[PDB]
Design a protein around this ligand. Sequence first.
Ligand SMILES: COC(=O)[C@@H]1C[C@H](C(=O)O)O[C@H]1[C@H](CC(C)C)NC(C)=O
Ligand SMILES: COC(=O)[C@@H]1C[C@H](C(=O)O)O[C@H]1[C@H](CC(C)C)NC(C)=O
Ligand SMILES: COC(=O)[C@@H]1C[C@H](C(=O)O)O[C@H]1[C@H](CC(C)C)NC(C)=O
Ligand SMILES: COC(=O)[C@@H]1C[C@H](C(=O)O)O[C@H]1[C@H](CC(C)C)NC(C)=O
Lengths: 387, 387, 387, 387
Amino acid sequence: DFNNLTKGLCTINSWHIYGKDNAVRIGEDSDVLVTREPYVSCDPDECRFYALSQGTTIRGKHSNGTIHDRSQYRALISWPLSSPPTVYNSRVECIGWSSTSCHDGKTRMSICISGPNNNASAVIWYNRRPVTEINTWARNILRTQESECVCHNGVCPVVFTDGSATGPAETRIYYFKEGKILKWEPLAGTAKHIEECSCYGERAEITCTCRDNWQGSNRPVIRIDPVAMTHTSQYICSPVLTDNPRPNDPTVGKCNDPYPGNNNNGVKGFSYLDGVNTWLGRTISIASRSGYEMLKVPNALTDDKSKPTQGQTIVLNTDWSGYSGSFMDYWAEGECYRACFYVELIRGRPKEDKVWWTSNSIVSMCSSTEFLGQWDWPDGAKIEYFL
Amino acid sequence: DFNNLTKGLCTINSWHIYGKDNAVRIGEDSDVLVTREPYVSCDPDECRFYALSQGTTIRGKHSNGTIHDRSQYRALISWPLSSPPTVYNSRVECIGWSSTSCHDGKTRMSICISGPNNNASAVIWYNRRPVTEINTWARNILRTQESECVCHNGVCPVVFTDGSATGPAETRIYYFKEGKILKWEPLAGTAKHIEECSCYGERAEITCTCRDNWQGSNRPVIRIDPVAMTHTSQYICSPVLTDNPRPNDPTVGKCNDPYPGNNNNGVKGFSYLDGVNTWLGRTISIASRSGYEMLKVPNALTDDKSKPTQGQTIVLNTDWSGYSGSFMDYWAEGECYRACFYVELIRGRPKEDKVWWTSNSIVSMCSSTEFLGQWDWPDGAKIEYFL
Amino acid sequence: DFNNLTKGLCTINSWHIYGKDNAVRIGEDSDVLVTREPYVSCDPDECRFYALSQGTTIRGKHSNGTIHDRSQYRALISWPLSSPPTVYNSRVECIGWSSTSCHDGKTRMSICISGPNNNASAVIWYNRRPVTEINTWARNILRTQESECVCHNGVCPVVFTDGSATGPAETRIYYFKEGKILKWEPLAGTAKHIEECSCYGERAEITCTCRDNWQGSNRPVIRIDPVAMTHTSQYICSPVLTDNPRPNDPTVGKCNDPYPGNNNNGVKGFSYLDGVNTWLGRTISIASRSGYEMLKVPNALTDDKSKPTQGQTIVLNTDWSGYSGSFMDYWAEGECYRACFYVELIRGRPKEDKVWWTSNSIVSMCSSTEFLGQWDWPDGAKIEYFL
Amino acid sequence: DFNNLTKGLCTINSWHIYGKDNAVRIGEDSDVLVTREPYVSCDPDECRFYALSQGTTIRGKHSNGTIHDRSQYRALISWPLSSPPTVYNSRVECIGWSSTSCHDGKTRMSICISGPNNNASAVIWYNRRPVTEINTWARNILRTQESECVCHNGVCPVVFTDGSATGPAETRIYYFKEGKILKWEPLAGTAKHIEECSCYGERAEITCTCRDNWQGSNRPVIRIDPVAMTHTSQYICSPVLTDNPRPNDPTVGKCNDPYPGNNNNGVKGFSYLDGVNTWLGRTISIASRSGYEMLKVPNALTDDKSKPTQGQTIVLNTDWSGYSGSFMDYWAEGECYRACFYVELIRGRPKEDKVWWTSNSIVSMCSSTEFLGQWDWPDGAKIEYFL
Ligand SMILES: COC(=O)[C@@H]1C[C@H](C(=O)O)O[C@H]1[C@H](CC(C)C)NC(C)=O
Ligand SMILES: COC(=O)[C@@H]1C[C@H](C(=O)O)O[C@H]1[C@H](CC(C)C)NC(C)=O
Ligand SMILES: COC(=O)[C@@H]1C[C@H](C(=O)O)O[C@H]1[C@H](CC(C)C)NC(C)=O
Ligand SMILES: COC(=O)[C@@H]1C[C@H](C(=O)O)O[C@H]1[C@H](CC(C)C)NC(C)=O
């Protein structure tokens, strides 16, 4: 049967290490594919790492220029937890340069979009075979979440966006079931721009924390109802701004508008909005994608004045970070859903340009009800060795 | 039970990306085997890429001279969809330099022919064990389809050819069932020469579009009946000639004779003859194997005057193409058979001779009922990196 | 159902070769991960090699400095028996720099501890998903056995230690069941210091032979009761001292105190205390970790005067050895539990410093009731080839 | 249930290609292990290649000196049919420098012998776990078949030899069942010396064709009865001598004595003694291990004057050959047992000494009832590329 979001989030008193692949370190001497936009996603019997390959190894020569986001050589691949996406272990889910993937409890739905900027198309795969296609509707880079979607009794919502990435665009929430479109609706609510949504589900409710790439430094939130196939948007009120770049933390935030200071930019990110048990993610730097932390910000979603009451350093401020998304092993044993997340430790261009490539590692963690000590999880590689 | 061709072809209003392995790109730095004559074929629980290995990696030194078609080091290998045929992932189906393979719904039948030009032999494997052998009957390079065959209630027809490749030869249609020969018949119909057939089945009918290597630029078609174990040959009337090389498109074509202009040459190819829902494949160039397109030519099979009413670019005219064959996931969910095909993106010799090898990548697509945007799918490699 | 320790140890009249991976030899030309602290552990349907990867290949450049014990790039990996821990075959059980792992008959429990020296945390995984966490309690390198634990009717005891490694510390015996803590107790008995325990079970009794890293050269023994969840500590009376370094063998040993001569040092080790059928392991050298032997010392556990009555050379005195732990295929056929053990053949730093790395191979053997001839099992590699 | 030899041999009117791995070619650029003494053996659901690894890749530096037969780094490995024994695909069955392996229909029994020349020991594994050990009985290199054994209703006979390899020695026929010794008997019959036996079974009878390494150029035959656990020895009467080196073919051969001309040497080999349907194998050269042929010698086993009535070239006289053994897919479909065999194409030392290694490829073929054309199957590699 299809998995149903019947549990709530477990209490998050800290975060324990869940997974790390050290792909860039290892890939300096093994056949590791170049990637970006990774994520983690579970099936009923296993969890795996996911990402968009560049169709080349890091040590390979075609790794030169992998700083590019959309090429015909990209594809969503998945592989064994905490292992490196290698040419021999990676499994191609589908071909494209933007994806999302989730398991409905019975089987998996993976979606890859591919094509030219002005005329791309998305293909929904279910049970490893293509079932539905969706053509661009705004003709300007059709794109999806870049992280696991969430299903409920067969329904798996997926947030898409088509149009400008620096002004109003056409965002849509699609409701699929066995790869077939049951219904889709345009973005409603007060969020003024939706990009790469990070989602999670619990108690029949799916919460996606995305990124306002044009005006907000205070990421938008899209709360979805998988049963009524309806949703709503907004922002995280809290003054603890979580995008990047982003102006410094104010004392009050905006709930239904983008908090200004930075335009036309940002980084995929996530959060766990669950009352007092609410945790946020943010790069530590406000200027670039470096260092990453988790901060317990009670009621951030609604308390336009909320500040951290606890936190945890994930990646030091002197180490490279990047994309961060949420996933949960919905098939795990227990009375609740252990909240997990991943951080993308980008290496290479643009920041480290003595190499011609751009790749990343992965570090993943899940919540603990204990109050555990922390450690920073760097990619670990030495660009020097790559010169 | 054995799968039965009980559906018709789905409407083809466009073509979506199905698979791509970027083997030559990746193989520049990983252990990827040298190949040619690839194809795609599905089982009830998965689909895979297939090809004739050269028994050597691309970066390997024995890759030197892999421009040769028949050596004792060749063999039909299959591997995971959209992955590169590597030394560690490729599975040897059988040994030979010409094959065909299909699944009857219960298990798979793969056939490899091997041996000296004047005295080769074919071996039919069923359920991964050899069952039947067939010796040359014309003593001049025994050869098969080079792409998936099609079964119906246990019967899987396979088109063979023995004799000259530049004049009359002995072509036969064999009817196997569990690897055993039930019956074989000589080529009947008006087709004057049959080489490397591309087939597909629907509504108890198997249609193979082959290539008249000696006189036709307008590929022959062999329509087979798996129940009555009888067939018939002809050509595609349409003036939209689909072989290569080939003279320019006339206004009227030949239905029961080879359309002249080019002799003793051509390229394996496919087509989907289904009334108005009829689609053709052809290299874009008329001189060499470069660029590839799909064109909706209603009734091409019977309308000796038919012209394109719609089309789609698969590979740009400035990129290398090659062999193209048809396959369909006959075990997919749905009311019809989604038509798919693959294009072989040959790299190396003879066209690109600064390297001593000849290999290829793979790009595969299946039909969509939507009207999707297009993108060209190049191999992606840079021979420069290989020097 | 959960496996139950219902058999006794088979008679040990000699030791036959069980497993060897020649990872350092092979890894000189293949992608083999750098490791340390290996072990062997069985499931109901297979046995595998285990170890703490360094997140890098031996030939890789990040192998430089792998002499370090705790980094964020370490992780417990398992792979196919007698094969080398490669980047493509190794499976990540969990992330950390100290582990233990056992199967309760139904599924496996693996534990990895990770973090900064002054504030680490342990994570218990059961059935491949995290279930329980345990924070440092003495704030000075939380650590576990470094070898397989043993379960009984669902209960799997694990010996931990936190605090100084050169003076009194806090050792605890935890009793888990399906990853959940049922109960834990502090170290009782007369053992004055517990480090890296090697355990085995038979007839409802679990016996762990650990290492007194601060004062004893005569390793301590912790006998555990999985049903009553109670234990007891002591030392091996025998004068045949089995740690390293260690003073020369006296005529009488200590039963309830550390036998002096060497302080603040040692090597993980094991033993089989079973009446007259009692066998010990020890490096042959008394100065460093080189050469390894097995010696039948009847009643060593209680006979403060016992001497060898038989023995077997495992690794010559002129070859590098290291850690040694016990495991038994508790799911094997037969009336008893064939005692097995592994020896870690460390290569590289500190002893062989012309290379910048530190890795190891593995050699494993199990007891025979026959009286078999012996052979020494060297790592086999040549550091010269690595320069 | 256990497989039972209930069929007879199919008629052998020719031989078709079954398997080839091109390991040395491929291994010039991929991580292929160095091996010798290969063979092929089937289980109820698959067939695989087997051999004794050298614990190193061909391109690896430890490949230097792999000309040696017994080292502590050797081990019996098995892998996917027609693929190369790679570091990532090879599976270690057991550790040793002499093996044999067969499947009784329920599970597999593999045996590896290891140790010093004057005091080795054999370990019998059943269902992948060690069960029985057997110590040397003549104290001079304990050794087995080097090719698949044959079982009947649970009983799997294995021919061993201990003592001189150039004079009388102690050969024994062991009868195992689930790895346990049921009974063993010393070599009886008129064969004066037994080494590396090649066996096959049909109609409750197991026939092993071995090699008289001290006096015979006309290989001995040991016919075994798996039910009565009794056997008998002899030689192949035929004057078509099949060992190597060997004097030229006489007109009459010896039935119960070694045919003289060459002493203290030979090559593992096989044959199919089945009345008129009797086929022999022999290197084509009489001086070294080069070229290989199959010859239909009716009644060779009993007709001390029999000459070839038909034959087939397997490997040309100008290509390297070596060991040859028999195997049959006893679980194949059909009314008879298709006779198969493998030839070891040794490369490197001693013949080709510009390299410091010694490895091999594999070529395998099975009988056809057809009269198929032939082709020679060379290893394919170019030692030049290895310099
Ligand atoms: C696959 O490429 C990415 O994820 C790129 C990576 C890049 C980044 O932020 O580093 O922006 C993503 C881009 C987002 C817009 C908002 C700039 N999405 C697509 C589909 O092009
Ligand atoms: C395996 O080799 C091929 O597929 C070769 C490849 C070559 C080509 O067209 O590029 O012709 C094929 C040849 C066809 C005749 C018509 C020239 N078939 C065989 C079995 O030799
Ligand atoms: C993973 O690291 C090890 O096993 C190290 C290896 C090192 C050795 O003896 O070679 O000591 C272990 C150390 C033990 C104390 C007693 C010195 N344990 C930890 C968790 O740091
Ligand atoms: C594993 O080594 C072999 O197979 C060696 C290979 C060598 C050969 O003939 O090339 O002789 C085998 C030798 C046979 C005696 C009769 C010389 N057997 C053992 C166990 O040492």
